[PDB]
């Protein structure tokens, strides 16, 4: 009658309690309430399905409240201190003239309503009129500086390529895709700002994912194997002329399912806790 | 609940492959003011392109999963009003059977 599905660590049976989290790579718009300079925000928490899992969040803000003018639109980029007027980002991606930029954001040329609210954005970025000067304007805003005209420009590329909208593609020739997407976000933004579409329900179970014992272990082994990967990188540097510590990966897993503190290893706060726990055996249904 | 299960997690590409092979203009070559009603197609929150006859694409997809050709655990939704086609393949989705 035993149904299994548990672990046996040091005798006691452990259960991995499923973890709930907001799904990633998902576009959501929210109203930022009264006291804010921002009125609506389009977030996407974007990450690689696996592979070091970038936890870069792309925020895209609509400044100006529903009462002000200069309702501009900027977006906070990974590794960049300031918020950047979207237009500049578009040009930093190769989409250079106004309205070629607008065309990515608004698929109807009769939605005068949406277009009007873009006019200010356009005026904002108006001051930077070609890709390389938008790359510099982006790279001037570190990080720090990188203080070198040619360096900050080749810096900015690096961010757009790798840290910005990191799903989709982290490779290269996809400014088209990334610019079109950024547009889709801006559309989804102005939509809610126009009382046309509704603000995202943050409680919709659909946009939630549950991590089971599989994904749970994977996150751990990943962390652990990369600890051993760079143990070898040291007994190789030592030998300036097969002792690869097998205990790390055993006693690592052990520690976790033992304590339920899901993090390498004894340096584990914050980590997440009560992820594993001793299995109830009071009653079969229990 | 009792019938609740969770997506193990599958791969997009045999869909992405299949999808463009069944009438998907890639985003690379989109120009909206030209086909401004194209249902835009997503997979795991990645915009891949657009489709001019989504009604009949949907059929092909729905028949694929129901036949077992696409994985029964994959999630495909057509939001007609909004003109979007979202598809999920990723692990973590709680689902029931009906």
């Amino acid at each position: 009658f035993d149904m299994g599905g548990y672990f046996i660590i040091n005798g006691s049976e452990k259960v991995l309690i499923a973890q709930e989290r907001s799904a990633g790579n998902i576009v959501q718009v929210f109203k930022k309430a009264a006291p804010s300079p921002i009125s609506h925000v389009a977030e996407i928490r974007s990450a690689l399905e696996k592979g070091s899992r970038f936890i870069s969040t792309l925020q895209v803000k609509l400044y100006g409240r529903e009462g002000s003018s200069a309702r501009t639109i900027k977006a906070t980029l990974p590794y960049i201190k300031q918020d950047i007027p979207i237009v500049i980002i578009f040009r930093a991606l190769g989409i250079i003239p106004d309205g070629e930029i607008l065309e990515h954001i608004c698929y109807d040329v009769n939605d005068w309503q949406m277009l009007e609210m873009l006019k200010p954005c356009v005026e904002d970025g108006f001051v930077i009129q070609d890709r390389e000067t938008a790359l510099d304007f982006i790279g001037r805003r570190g990080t720090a500086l990188g203080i070198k005209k040619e360096k900050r420009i080749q810096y900015a590329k690096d961010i757009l390529q790798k840290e910005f909208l990191p799903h989709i593609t982290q490779l290269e020739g996809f400014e088209s895709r990334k610019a079109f997407f950024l547009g889709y976000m801006i559309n989804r933004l102005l939509l809610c700002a126009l009382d046309r579409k509704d603000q995202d329900d943050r409680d919709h179970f659909g946009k939630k994912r549950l991590d089971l014992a599989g994904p749970l272990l994977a996150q751990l082994f990943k962390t652990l194997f990369k600890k051993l990967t760079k143990d070898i990188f040291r007994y190789m540097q030592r030998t300036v002329e097969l002792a690869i510590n097998a205990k790390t990966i055993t006693s690592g897993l052990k520690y976790a399912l033992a304590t339920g503190n899901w993090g390498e290893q004894k340096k584990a706060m914050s980590s997440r806790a009560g992820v594993s726990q001793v299995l109830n055996r009071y009653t079969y249904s229990s | 609940s009792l019938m609740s299960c969770i997506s193990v997690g599958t791969d997009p590409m045999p869909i992405i492959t299949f999808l463009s092979e069944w009438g998907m203009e890639p985003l690379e070559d989109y120009v909206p003011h030209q086909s401004p009603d194209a249902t835009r197609v997503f997979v795991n929150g990645v915009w891949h392109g657009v489709h001019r006859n989504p009604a009949r694409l949907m059929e092909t997809l729905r028949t694929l999963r129901r036949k077992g050709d696409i994985n029964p655990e994959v999630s495909m939704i057509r939001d007609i009003r909004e003109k979007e086609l979202k598809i999920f393949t990723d692990a973590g989705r709680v689902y029931r059977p009906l």
Binding site: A213, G214, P215, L217, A218, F225, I232 | I6, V8
Partner: peptide, 30 residues
């Protein structure tokens, strides 16, 4: 969930990063 982790995922993690200056190929589970 676990099954899939063992069968697939575990291989993936072993060689998505991995290789040094030493490479890691297939993984065997007893």
């Amino acid at each position: 969930s676990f099954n899939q982790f063992v069968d697939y995922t575990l291989q993936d993690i072993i060689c998505e990063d991995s290789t040094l200056i030493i490479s890691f190929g297939k993984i065997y589970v007893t």
